[PDB]
């Protein structure tokens, strides 16, 4: 009980100065307090995608630890992914959720073909790589759901994507690399310059600049 922010960003979120995560993203501000994500995205649902047991050989024998993989998202364009190791699974899952929240990125939903209704798919073909695993996301028409393996399908669902084709290459059974590659891929949508984004936008002042006194100390 009782959260005391330790960062400038946390203080600005503790006061009603910053009310959405898109203000965080506009200035690429680093997030270090999970309470920021809880306040701005109150309705988050998590899912423990995989649990693995890793062992470290010692002089007498193995010292076993538990590795947890957690996927977080709001099903409306924001998604995160966390992997953390601890002695116990319950503490590992709880801590993996925290760092999954800290890494939450926005995604661009777009239209396959006509722009009728709300965006339902990706705006362009994207690809991500981690290890040997390469995950490719292709925009899909409104009928096909998530054409992906159950591991990749869950990441897409929590991000709010309705319509997408998928193709993966490499050792997809390495679950951590597959999710990390897809997380990088889904985040590249806000890295791909499209002609509708060609317009130059003015650089607004950072929220850390306009509210300097509330973040002082």
């Amino acid at each position: 009980k009782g959260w005391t922010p330790v960062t400038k960003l946390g203080r600005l979120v503790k006061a009603g100065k910053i009310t959405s995560v898109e203000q965080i993203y506009l200035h690429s501000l680093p997030v270090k307090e999970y309470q920021i994500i809880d306040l701005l995205l109150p309705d988050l649902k998590d899912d423990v995608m995989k649990i693995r047991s890793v062992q470290k050989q010692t002089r007498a024998g193995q010292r076993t630890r538990m590795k947890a993989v957690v996927v977080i998202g709001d099903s409306n364009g924001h998604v995160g992914l966390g992997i953390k190791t601890a002695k116990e699974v319950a503490s590992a899952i709880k801590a993996a959720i925290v760092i999954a929240k800290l890494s939450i990125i926005p995604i661009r939903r777009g239209y396959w073909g006509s722009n009728l209704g709300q965006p339902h798919s990706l705006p362009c073909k994207v690809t991500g790589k981690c290890g040997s695993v390469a995950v490719r996301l292709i925009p899909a028409p409104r009928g096909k759901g998530i054409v992906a393996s159950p591991v990749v399908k869950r990441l897409m669902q929590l991000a709010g994507v309705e319509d997408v084709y998928t193709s993966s290459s490499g050792s997809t059974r390495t679950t951590e690399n597959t999710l990390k590659a897809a997380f990088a891929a889904i985040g590249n949508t806000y890295s791909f310059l499209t002609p509708n984004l060609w317009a130059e936008t003015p650089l607004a002042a950072s929220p850390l600049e306009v509210y300097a006194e509330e973040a002082a100390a």
Binding site: Y111, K125, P139, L193, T194
Partner: protein, 129 residues
């Protein structure tokens, strides 16, 4: 040896744009190179470019504006029928709403969207987006 001067031109453009440079030197020039750049310039993917006469094949200096994701050639210049253009645009372009496949048709060099408008087809030459 030098088997495709358009590939050399686009390779120089790709390497300069990815490294953030706003200008690139291309050698040698050609009519196809100039017309490929003109199509790119018409859609805003490059800026002004300059042809330098050296009493030889020539050189070109192109101004880059950072909007270019990728331009490339298709070697060889495959023959493309009109019913095959849909398959080519699906494979090469990032989406159905932007990007262009450049063709050389007997009606001239043009993007696949202009090619659909004038109902012509030729050999595939490259792409840009």
């Amino acid at each position: 040896t030098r088997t495709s001067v358009l590939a050399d031109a686009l390779n120089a453009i790709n390497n300069a744009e990815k490294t953030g440079k706003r200008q690139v030197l291309i050698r040698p020039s050609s009519k196809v190179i100039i017309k490929f750049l003109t199509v790119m310039q018409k859609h805003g993917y490059i800026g002004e470019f300059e042809y330098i006469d050296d009493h030889r094949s020539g050189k070109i200096v192109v101004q880059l504006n950072g909007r270019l994701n990728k331009c490339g050639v298709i070697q060889p210049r495959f023959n493309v029928k009109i019913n095959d253009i849909e398959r080519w645009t699906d494979n090469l372009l990032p989406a159905r709403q932007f990007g262009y496949v450049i063709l050389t048709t007997s009606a001239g060099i043009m993007d696949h969207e202009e090619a659909r408008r004038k109902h012509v087809s030729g050999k595939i030459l490259g792409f840009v987006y």
